[PDB]
Design a protein around this ligand. Structure first.
Ligand SMILES: Nc1ncnc2c1ncn2[C@@H]1O[C@H](COP(=O)(O)OP(=O)(O)O)[C@@H](O)[C@H]1O
Ligand SMILES: Clc1ccc(C2=CSC3=NCCN23)cc1
Ligand SMILES: [Mg+2]
Ligand SMILES: [Mg+2]
Length: 265
């Protein structure tokens, strides 16, 4: 149906491991969107065709204001092209580099939008598994949007494919290759909330080998400026035992959240 010919391409919006994402406008409708480009050879060399298919299937059928839309796809013997909703205010990653740390109101508001988004996902037993600042985008009114569903699945699950880069956001059960469920996204939520307030993730470390050690041991400390209510929430989500991690409904009505977030559930 669609092809390269139907689009005028604009400036680069970002780069990922496989993905190279561009601003683009559809010629007849003048519709502005984002074009995620993937090189078939690398997709094959790494054998992650199944991830791409998972990404397209899951993201196209989801509908939530805090989840990034995927409108379709096409391909052309060297490349695959994913047609995405354009997020005009960029990544949460960029915003963190800009401001160094977020205040409590900003942090709590992001956490609420996230927990709403994940709640919707878990109600279809979809687990995202790759929640981090580069994969969180911002809409025109500054609202948070989860994106990049390459690693997502239905639960329960084992990990069949190789973890490529950073360990910083993954729970103990996932790095250790065990099986896992919805609770992995709740660990990641804890990691984010820490990083939003402090400027760095709680198990950050100079080598792969050491980060692995700090995560399986749950070794983290707070700077003095982190308030008691934030400490309470984070300590509850970063539980070694998945079953001890709270439910999203509890996160959404935690006192520190309700006091500080400017958005409802
Ligand atoms: N819809 C979008 N709007 C704006 N920027 C985007 C969009 N999608 C991706 N980007 C930028 O491109 C980067 C990589 O996109 P992503 O889909 O996460 O690729 P990968 O799967 O390779 O990580 C993101 O971190 C972001 O900076
Ligand atoms: Cl190539 C292309 C062109 C348009 C759209 C679209 C998605 S939502 C929407 N509301 C009006 C048009 N439109 C998607 C892809
Ligand atoms: Mg990504
Ligand atoms: Mg990906």
């Amino acid at each position: 149906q669609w092809a390269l010919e139907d689009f005028e391409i604009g400036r680069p919006l970002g780069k990922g491991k496989f993905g190279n994402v561009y601003l683009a406008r559809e010629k007849q409708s003048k519709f502005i969107l984002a074009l995620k480009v993937l090189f078939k050879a690398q997709l094959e060399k790494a054998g992650v065709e199944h991830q791409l298919r998972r990404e397209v299937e899951i993201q196209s059928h989801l509908r939530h204001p805090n989840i990034l839309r995927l409108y379709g796809y096409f391909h052309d013997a060297t490349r695959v092209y994913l047609i995405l909703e354009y997020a005009p205010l960029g990544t949460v990653y960029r915003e963190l580099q800009k401001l160094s740390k977020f205040d409590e109101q900003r942090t709590a508001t992001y956490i609420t939008e996230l927990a709403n988004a994940l709640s919707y996902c878990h109600s279809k037993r979809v687990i995202h598994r790759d929640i981090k600042p580069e994969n969180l985008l911002l809409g025109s009114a500054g609202e948070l949007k989860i994106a990049d569903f390459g690693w997502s699945v239905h639960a329960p699950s084992s990990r069949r494919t190789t973890l490529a880069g950073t360990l910083d956001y993954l729970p103990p059960e996932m790095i250790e290759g065990r099986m896992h469920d919805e609770k992995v996204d709740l660990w990641s939520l804890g990691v984010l909330c820490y990083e939003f307030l402090v400027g760095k993730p709680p198990f950050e470390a100079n080598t792969y080998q050491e980060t692995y050690k700090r995560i399986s041991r749950v070794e983290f400390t707070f700077p003095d400026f982190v308030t008691e209510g934030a400490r309470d929430l984070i300590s509850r989500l970063l539980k070694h035992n998945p079953s001890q991690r709270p439910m999203l409904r509890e996160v959404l009505e935690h006192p520190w959240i309700t006091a500080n977030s400017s958005k409802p559930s």
